[PDB]
Amino acid sequence: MDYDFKVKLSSERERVEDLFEYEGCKVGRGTYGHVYKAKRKDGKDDKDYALKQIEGTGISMSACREIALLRELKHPNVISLQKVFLSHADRKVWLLFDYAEHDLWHIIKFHRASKANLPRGMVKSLLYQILDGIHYLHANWVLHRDLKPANILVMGEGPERGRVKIADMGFARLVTFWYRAPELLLGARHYTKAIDIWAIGCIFAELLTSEPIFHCRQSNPYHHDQLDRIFNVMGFPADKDWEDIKKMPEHSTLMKDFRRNTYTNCSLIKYMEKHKVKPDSKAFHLLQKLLTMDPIKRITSEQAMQDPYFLEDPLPTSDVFAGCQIPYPKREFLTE
Amino acid sequence: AMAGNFWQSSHYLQWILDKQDLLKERQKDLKFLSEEEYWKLQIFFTNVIQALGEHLKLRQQVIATATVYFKRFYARYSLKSIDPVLMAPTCVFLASKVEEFGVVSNTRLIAAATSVLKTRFSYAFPKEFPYRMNHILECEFYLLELMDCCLIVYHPYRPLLQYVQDMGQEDMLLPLAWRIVNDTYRTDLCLLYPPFMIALACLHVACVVQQKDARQWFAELSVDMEKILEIIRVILKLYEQWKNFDERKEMATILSKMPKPKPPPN
Numbered sequence: 298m299d300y301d302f303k304v305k306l307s308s309e310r311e312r313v314e315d316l317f318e319y320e321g322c323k324v325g326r327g328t329y330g331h332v333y334k335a336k337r338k339d340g341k342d343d344k345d346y347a348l349k350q351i352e353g354t355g356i357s358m359s360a361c362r363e364i365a366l367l368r369e370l371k372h373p374n375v376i377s378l379q380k381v382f383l384s385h386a387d388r389k390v391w392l393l394f395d396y397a398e399h400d401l402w403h404i405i406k407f408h409r410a411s412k413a414n415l416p417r418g419m420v421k422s423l424l425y426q427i428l429d430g431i432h433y434l435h436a437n438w439v440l441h442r443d444l445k446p447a448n449i450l451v452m453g454e455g456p457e458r459g460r461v462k463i464a465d466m467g468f469a470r471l472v473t474f475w476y477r478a479p480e481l482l483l484g485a486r487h488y489t490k491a492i493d494i495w496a497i498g499c500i501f502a503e504l505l506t507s508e509p510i511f512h513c514r515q516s517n518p519y520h521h522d523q524l525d526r527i528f529n530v531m532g533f534p535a536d537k538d539w540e541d542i543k544k545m546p547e548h549s550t551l552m553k554d555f556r557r558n559t560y561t562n563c564s565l566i567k568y569m570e571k572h573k574v575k576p577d578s579k580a581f582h583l584l585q586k587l588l589t590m591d592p593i594k595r596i597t598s599e600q601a602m603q604d605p606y607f608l609e610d611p612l613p614t615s616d617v618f619a620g621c622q623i624p625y626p627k628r629e630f631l632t633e
Numbered sequence: 634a635m636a637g638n639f640w641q642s643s644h645y646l647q648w649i650l651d652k653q654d655l656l657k658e659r660q661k662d663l664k665f666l667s668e669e670e671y672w673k674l675q676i677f678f679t680n681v682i683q684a685l686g687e688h689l690k691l692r693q694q695v696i697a698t699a700t701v702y703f704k705r706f707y708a709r710y711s712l713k714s715i716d717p718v719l720m721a722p723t724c725v726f727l728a729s730k731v732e733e734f735g736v737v738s739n740t741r742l743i744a745a746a747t748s749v750l751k752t753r754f755s756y757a758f759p760k761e762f763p764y765r766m767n768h769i770l771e772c773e774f775y776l777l778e779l780m781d782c783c784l785i786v787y788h789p790y791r792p793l794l795q796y797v798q799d800m801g802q803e804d805m806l807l808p809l810a811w812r813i814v815n816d817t818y819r820t821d822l823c824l825l826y827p828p829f830m831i832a833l834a835c836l837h838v839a840c841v842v843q844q845k846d847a848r849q850w851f852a853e854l855s856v857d858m859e860k861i862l863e864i865i866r867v868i869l870k871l872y873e874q875w876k877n878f879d880e881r882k883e884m885a886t887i888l889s890k891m892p893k894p895k896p897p898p899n
């Protein structure tokens with residue numbers, strides 16, 4: 298390499314640890330890496346930032362995907378990438394984002410805790426915004442591949458108050474499956490838009506009841522205990538309800554392991570009736586159209602946004618909290 | 634993924650460069666090489682990337698993306714900053730990750746780079762490929778940042794296919810038009826014009842070559858026909874340069890004239 302070019306780039310190169318204060322402030326840890334609540338060292342801001350060090354060294358397929366996609370995506374309901382820091386010394390990649398004080402995992406947990414011890418259309422506004430962002434991704438032929446409450450962020454106090462931000466575009470491809478569509482559990486060889494739509498339905502049922510609808514206990518692309526949990530809620534799919542179930546790679550394993558009569562009184566109706574959600578409501582009918590067993594018989598995000606449920610009072614708001622003092626506590630830190 | 638997003642893409646907003654801006658930056662290297670030698674070098678490394686991509690059984694879109702990263706890097710930087718011989722396989726490696734093909738193994742990437750230069754490019758490289766995976770991974774950090782992380786690249790193959798489908802002359806013209814699209818990578822066209830425009834220009838030359846009358850179809854397009862004629866001229870010019878250029882006899886000398894990296898203080 299040219300020495301003059303090397304020293305000049307090194308001098309210009311902005312360092313993550315010189316620009317931000319984040320040590321000790323880790324709010325998340327997972328396969329995606331480490332997320333921190335950061336503050337600018339120069340003080341010409343006072344804003345809070347989400348700073349992510351990507352898992353592993355170098356440009357992984359996952360890091361590659363998130364950087365490539367976030368660089369092109371511009372939607373109010375999809376988290377915006379602001380900066381990329383390439384820590385040359387240790388081959389670590391850091392990503393700068395605005396800080397979302399809340400996420401759907403923490404909000405749902407708060408409600409679940411309260412039951413053991415949601416203003417008008419907060420659930421509806423969260424749904425419309427989740428749908429809106431996924432619709433923009435699907436329009437641009439981008440699949441989330443791993444939608445779940447933890448990566449559905451929601452902004453706290455500030456100019457974007459109560460706005461949904463879809464996070465983690467790094468699920469690249471070549472122990473919990475509560476949000477995996479039934480076709481994936483039967484060895485479907487591709488990710489599709491309907492897989493993200495199935496996932497949105499699980500979040501919608503979790504927002505309406507506080508419980509993960511397909512909550513199942515803890516390598517093989519076929520998961521029995523999870524498929525059993527799906528049938529306990531939905532029921533066993535009739536031949537007419539999903540004709541291409543026969544075409545799934547794990548179909549004869551499903552026939553060997555399961556029996557239609559086990560789930561004879563199982564329906565989404567009976568499940569939501571127990572969780573005090575009226576089956577004749579417009580919220581139920583929309584939920585049912587998202588939670589369809591057959592991926593080809595599953596509604597689209599564009600179609601979901603046109604549902605009359607969004608026209609029914611109250612209308613969705615741009616601020617899911619709608620003025621109301623956010624009862625949710627701020628995100629607590631971790632220790633590594 | 635990001636299909637009809639061209640007018641809102643990083644590619645359009647940042648990587649459709651001004652020709653005078655491009656030539657101005659090139660002047661640093663036009664001290665060591667003539668304009669003709671610079672073009673001949675840019676044709677050469679386009680052919681190296683293509684041979685590398687073939688060896689790794691990679692799709693054309695991966696090769697085309699690799700070529701664009703390479704072109705983009707040397708549009709802003711000099712041939713001395715990073716060795717293009719290290720840069721070309723680095724571009725292939727990153728383009729396969731971006732394009733969801735996979736991560737080419739350390740052994741396989743270095744062996745493809747070694748075998749390709751030894752068997753197919755021995756006229757220009759007497760020595761064996763000298764770089765190791767640590768050099769490729771290092772160069773990758775540099776290429777990534779000195780492109781502003783702009784990884785999504787639009788090519789003319791996608792619009793070309795739509796164009797010949799509309800025409801209904803897929804069987805007759807697509808093999809030739811597609812070939813001409815490959816040839817436009819020997820030139821700066823990808824850095825100056827939107828991909829659909831290069832596709833229309835390539836389809837036009839293919840129509841001329843095969844004597845297919847598409848005047849009406851072309852008149853029915855809402856496009857700046859002057860911009861298409863500019864691209865066509867570059868394509869016709871490329872074929873005269875192709876005829877008058879023998880890379881096998883001229884490339885070892887053109888590579889020696891090229892500027893080399895200043896070493897660290899010793």
Ligand SMILES: N#Cc1cc(C(=O)N2CCC[C@H](c3ccnc(N4CC[C@@H](F)C4)n3)C2)c[nH]1
Nearest residue numbers: 324325329332347349376394397447448464465
């Ligand atoms: N990438 C990613 C990702 C995060 C999570 C996740 O489990 N959670 C819960 C714990 C707090 C995490 C958080 C908080 C604020 N911002 C971000 N961001 C900002 C953009 C992205 F880095 C995630 N993350 C969210 C799943 N995938």
